[PDB]
Amino acid sequence: CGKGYHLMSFPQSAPHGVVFLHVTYVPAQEKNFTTAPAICHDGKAHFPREGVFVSNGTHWFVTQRNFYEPQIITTDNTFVSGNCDVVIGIVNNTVYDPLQPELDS
């Protein structure tokens, strides 16, 4: 159904044949980032739910794979599995939690 990520197609008639106009999505402008598999926080390993942990020169973010939409690393979009000495390439960073500013108010 075409080359790229398929969205739609439109048929057209032709003499002794058919013609398909496949609509596809193609990524355009890539950018380099520094990545890591997991985030170590308080002796816990945080993995992304559906996304990728990337970093610019200072901070760390979690974003979707096919588009650059960075967001703050939160316990809402991450899950905890085990501790920090089982993952190769784990990096230390803090993980924001939404309940704490509600508690400190």
Place this chain on the structure above:
Amino acid sequence: AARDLICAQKFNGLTVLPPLLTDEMIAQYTSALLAGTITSGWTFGAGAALQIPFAMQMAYRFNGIGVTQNVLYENQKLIANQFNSAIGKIQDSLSSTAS
């Protein structure tokens, strides 16, 4: 004195044409596909080549088959050892069995 079949086939008007693509070019296509697959996953098949670490690519595949990626990230050495033993089994079977 040992007359071949191919000499009689050529002398009786039958000719075998050579293919357009040589084995070196076929192997270079295979090498390009392997290098693109290893260093970019599937993104090179859908546009530009996007680099990714291979452990994270395998975690993407594990999420593809419905398994949580911590299973990969806590069993990476065992999975790599199983892959190496499987590749050795394939090369030993191809060395042994000719059928």
